[PDB]
Design a protein around this ligand. Structure first.
Ligand SMILES: Nc1ncnc2c1ncn2[C@@H]1O[C@H](COP(=O)(O)OP(=O)(O)O)[C@@H](O)[C@H]1O
Ligand SMILES: Nc1ncnc2c1ncn2[C@@H]1O[C@H](COP(=O)(O)OP(=O)(O)O)[C@@H](O)[C@H]1O
Ligand code: BEF
Ligand SMILES: [Mg+2]
Ligand SMILES: [Mg+2]
Lengths: 434, 49, 77, 430
């Protein structure tokens, strides 16, 4: 029925209209300063005027860093382009790393557009070259009340004749894109053959010409890849071009200049609009100093939207360096341009509260004494261990045909499962690397 | 006016049972952008040649 | 439809009645569902009513249950 | 109508020098660094001098001191029509393009060439369109009267023009622009446009371009889309030689003239020794642009070597280049720059709050206050007041911790996080 993995318990940050973080709201406990800072980011990005600022989360394991990322993503909404990312995947084997960085930065920028398409439909009565002739064909579409003839381009007619359409075939044809598609045969010819694989469909209703506005959203990266290389086509030259190069290539600076100029013209027209995005990169400490020194310039850009980072280390050596040991594995030059949100760990009461909340969303019922147990051993080992053991305890209750997780259930669960500490301890007494 | 309410009730009835309010499901047509930045430079390339 | 044949026909080949929509159903639903309810019926009649959630149908049905379904004049939420 | 947002360099528009290279203390958003701004004027006179080439200048200094701001202000001072290139040292490091030819292309893109071409344009409102032809034999003879404020002339149009006029739908009242050589048609408005003057207007069309574009075009027939997509690489040097000779003869006969561009390279301390030697040898090129170095790193080991060269660069590069540095900022410089931030991003910060932000910027860092002034906007408007007070600044300071504060916090919380070995304690008991 329901699916979850350490998350989906977040329905929002859980603030008020005044910006004060409620103690328990949106399935959140503690981190009041962190939640208020996240709301500061919320009304930073709602202003959509700021650009080029970096905010990272400083916290250890189980500190709710990526949980806070899920919270901010949830409160951002579908319209706001949020792009989660992992600091390890930025390493690319086919293209340079900085190209991937700029690619995801351009992905972060989204922009709503409005457009109207022209729709033609009906049954074609003639497929004949005009006449002393050239590769053009007149086509006459017959709808329920639409009756028009159309002369078409050689390429679109080539796509038409590759669609194997004929007289008595109702088709769906667009004017702007030019994509061809046959709906089928008219029901008037259903009786003509007693049996036929081809299915008969009614004549299109209404008039052949149609109009409608489209408010579809598109990121600037999608436009850049659209005008960088062709995307689709029903004519042979389209596949020729696509198969000429399937390799992804970098983007020139002048290409970015022209795409931002054209989108500036479109937004000046009064139709286009722009909305910044949020970039979340997991374990930014995992990437190399090369990306750091490229971001030293990338942060100083103009259209570069707000980026959120996270780390799980302290006074550690920077990747690609020997003597450059820095906090969070981030060199000082970038941290001068970085702002930090401090996080805090969780003690017994809030650990118990989060476990019982995620058990409620887990649709598992835990008795009070078993709640006390999971509060107990969820502290001297980790909260994550009790979080994992929640489901096996419920299933062990189910096997005993009981709907309540009891102290005995968690007892056998912890007896037949060992944590990292127990694994290390039993590794201490090893005959042959046990 | 209650006739506005009756009208709204009719659209509610005709949209709730089935998406029959003008029943326009987008065919997901692509953007047909006509800038063609290559056209802004084909003239320059021709002059160079 | 409600006004097509759900008035006086004597159909007796079925045992189930399904109502897709009934905006004004203090009376019409009764005869519509009992059209199949005929003497030549050897089995019980199952009546299925279609309602949605957070819509006009749910509000109308719940308020009719609240007031024992006397008469609906104003529908709002 | 450029699309610009608030940025760390969007405030400055021009250096703000004098005729005698005298920098005004507060000019065009650029403040302080009198010697640096005088050197900026010197490199200006270099770049619009045009008679010198192959000059390398080094700009160094402490972090966050605005050397990048100095370069951005210099670029703004150059203005339009001057080819300027700004890039960091990480973009060159690529696998499809080796470092050496990438740097060659970086040099090549810098210098631009002006091309002046005369065009024949026919622009006037149409009266009617009448095309003679055959029903099945062709024999197209198109005619259409063209009118303006001072002529009413009938024109017999050739096959190409009327084929185009059949391609694009036009009506009698529509106005179109006709060029004789190309034969293309451009219509913009309907009786919207009020054409005037002579039909046979003889106006030139001037096109600027770097020699990189012509090099890529001549390298390959696919070079058009190659430069439009960047998937070029390893152009034969004989093409470079022939194109250099061709532009040389063009210069002597004067049909086209070159514009020596400006190259900006950042983070040269992370540059490789092979690239250093390539720069050392390519500086002697006659077509060598004026390039400045932006090294934010001091004494460090040059990449590819185990030797800790000063300024992170080998002395061979430093010998054939001049070096200037930048200094710190006294508290009044911080005051001025934060005032420029407040006016640029529209912050009505309180005077006492302004002083508190000035102090916090002075002791900690400039960019910390530069972001605090931005966050103070929403910290104030959340209580619905346009002005920003001292309590908002203190709230921003306590909410968003500082780098030194985080360093201290982790120094007594080493066990909270992982170490160099990676060990970390998660249990709260024993
Ligand atoms: N305020 C909170 N309320 C509920 N659950 C929380 C809270 N903070 C952290 N958690 C839980 O702690 C776990 C650790 O969060 P996450 O950021 O994903 O890992 P880490 O903190 O190690 O980066 C998450 O699965 C989340 O469910
Ligand atoms: N004289 C100045 N006028 C205006 N802004 C300045 C000045 N000096 C420094 N700044 C600001 O300080 C910031 C320093 O950033 P940057 O130049 O990238 O660091 P670095 O100086 O280490 O290269 C710039 O973004 C710039 O806006
Ligand atoms: F004919 Be009835 F009233 F069923
Ligand atoms: Mg996390
Ligand atoms: Mg800098």
């Amino acid at each position: 029925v329901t699916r979850t993995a350490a998350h989906t318990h977040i329905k929002g940050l859980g603030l008020d209209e005044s910006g004060v973080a409620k103690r328990v709201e949106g399935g959140f406990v503690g981190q009041i300063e962190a939640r208020e800072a996240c709301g500061v980011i919320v009304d930073l990005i709602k202003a959509k005027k700021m650009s080029g600022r970096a905010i990272l989360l400083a916290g250890g394991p189980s500190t709710g860093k990526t949980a806070l990322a899920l919270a901010i993503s949830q409160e951002l909404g579908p319209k706001v382009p949020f792009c989660p990312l992992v600091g390890s995947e930025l390493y690319s084997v086919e293209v340079k790393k900085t190209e991937t960085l700029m690619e995801n930065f351009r992905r972060a920028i989204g922009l709503r557009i409005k457009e109207t398409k022209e729709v033609y439909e009906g049954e074609v009565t003639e497929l004949t070259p005009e006449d002393k002739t050239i590769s053009h064909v007149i086509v006459g579409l017959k709808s329920a009340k639409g009756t028009k003839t159309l002369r078409l381009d050689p390429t679109i007619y080539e796509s038409i004749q590759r669609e194997k359409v004929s007289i008595g075939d109702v088709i769906y044809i667009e004017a702007n894109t030019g994509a061809v598609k046959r709906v089928g045969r008219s029901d008037a010819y259903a009786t003509e053959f007693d049996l036929e694989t081809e299915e008969y469909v009614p004549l299109p209703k209404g008039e052949v010409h149609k109009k409608k506005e489209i408010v579809q959203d598109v990121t600037l990266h999608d436009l850049d890849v659209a005008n960088a290389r062709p995307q689709g086509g029903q004519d042979v030259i389209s596949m020729m071009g696509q198969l000429l190069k399937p390799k992804k290539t970098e983007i020139t600076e002048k290409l970015r200049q022209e795409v931002n100029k054209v989108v500036a013209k479109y937004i000046d027209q009064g139709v286009a609009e722009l909305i910044p995005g949020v970039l979340f990169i997991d374990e930014v400490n995992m990437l190399d100093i090369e990306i750091f020194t490229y971001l030293n310039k990338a942060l100083e850009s103009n259209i570069a939207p707000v980026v959120v980072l996270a780390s799980n280390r302290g006074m550690t050596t920077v990747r690609g360096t020997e003597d450059v040991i820095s906090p969070h594995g981030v060199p000082p030059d970038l941290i001068d341009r970085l702002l930090i949100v401090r996080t805090l760990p969780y003690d017994k009461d809030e650990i118990r509260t989060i476990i019982e909340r995620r058990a409620t969303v887990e649709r598992l019922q835990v008795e009070s004494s078993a709640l006390d147990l999971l509060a107990t051993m969820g502290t001297e080992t980790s909260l994550r261990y009790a979080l994992q053991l929640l489901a096996p305890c419920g299933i062990l209750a189910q096997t005993s045909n009981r709907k309540e997780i009891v102290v005995n259930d968690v007892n056998e669960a912890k007896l037949l499962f060992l944590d990292a500490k127990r694994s290390t301890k039993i590794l201490e007494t090893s005959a042959n690397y046990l | 006016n209650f006739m506005s309410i009756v009208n709204c009730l009719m659209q509610l009835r005709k949209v709730c049972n089935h998406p029959n309010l003008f029943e326009v499901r987008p065919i997901l047509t692509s953007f047909v952008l006509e800038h063609c930045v290559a056209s802004d430079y084909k003239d320059v390339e021709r002059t160079l040649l | 439809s409600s006004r097509s044949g759900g008035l006086g026909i004597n159909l007796t080949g079925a045992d189930t009645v399904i109502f897709y929509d009934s905006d004004w159903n203090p009376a019409m639903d009764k005869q519509c569902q009992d059209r199949c309810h005929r003497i030549g019926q050897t089995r019980d009649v199952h009546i299925y009513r279609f309602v949605s959630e957070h819509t006009i149908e749910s509000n109308i049905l719940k308020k009719a249950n609240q007031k024992r379904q006397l008469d609906n004049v104003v529908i709002q939420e | 109508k450029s699309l610009s947002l608030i940025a760390a360099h969007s405030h400055i528009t021009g250096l703000g020098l004098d005729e005698n290279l005298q920098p005004r203390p507060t000019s065009e958003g650029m403040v302080g660094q009198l010697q640096a701004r005088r050197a900026a004027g010197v490199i200006l006179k270099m770049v619009q001098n045009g008679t010198i080439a192959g000059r390398a200048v080094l700009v160094a200094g402490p972090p966050s001191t605005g050397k990048t701001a100095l370069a951005m202000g210099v670029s703004q001072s150059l203005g339009k029509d001057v080819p300027f290139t700004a890039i960091a040292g990480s973009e060159i490091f690529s696998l499809e393009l080796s470092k050496t030819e990438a740097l060659t292309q970086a040099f090549r893109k810098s210098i631009g060439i002006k091309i002046k071409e005369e065009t024949e344009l026919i622009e006037g409102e149409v009266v009617e369109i009448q095309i003679d032809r055959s029903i099945t034999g062709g024999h197209k003879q198109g005619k259409l009267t063209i009118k303006t404020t001072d002529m009413e002339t009938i024109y017999e149009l050739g096959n190409k023009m009327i084929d185009g006029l059949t391609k694009e739908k036009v009506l009698a009242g529509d106005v179109i622009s006709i060029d004789k050589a190309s034969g293309k048609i451009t219509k913009l408005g309907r009786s919207v446009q009020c054409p005037e003057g002579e039909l046979q207007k003889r106006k030139t069309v001037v096109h600027t371009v770097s020699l990189h574009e012509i090099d890529v075009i001549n390298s390959r027939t696919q070079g058009f889309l190659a430069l439009f997509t960047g998937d070029t690489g390893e152009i034969r040097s004989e093409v470079r030689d022939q194109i250099n000779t061709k532009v040389a003869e063009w210069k002597e006969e004067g049909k086209a003239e070159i514009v020596p561009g400006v190259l900006f390279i950042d983070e040269v301390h992370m540059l490789d020794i092979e690239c250093f030697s390539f720069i050392n040898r390519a500086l002697e090129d006659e077509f060598a642009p004026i390039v400045m170095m932006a090294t934010n790193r001091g004494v460090s080991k040059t990449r590819g070597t185990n030797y800790k060269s000063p300024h992170g660069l080998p002395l061979d590069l430093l010998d054939r280049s001049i070096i200037i540095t930048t200094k710190s900022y006294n508290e009044q410089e911080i005051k001025t720059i934060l005032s420029i931030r407040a006016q640029e991003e529209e912050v009505e910060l309180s005077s006492d709050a302004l002083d508190l932000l000035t102090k916090t910027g002075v002791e900690t860092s400039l960019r910390y206050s530069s972001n605090l002034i931005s966050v103070a906007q929403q910290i104030a408007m959340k209580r619905k007041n346009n002005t920003v007070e001292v309590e908002d600044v203190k709230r921003a300071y306590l909410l968003f911790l500082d780098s030194a504060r985080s360093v201290k916090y982790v120094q007594e919380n080493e066990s909270q996080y992982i170490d160099d070995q990676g060990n970390v304690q998660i249990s709260i008991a024993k």
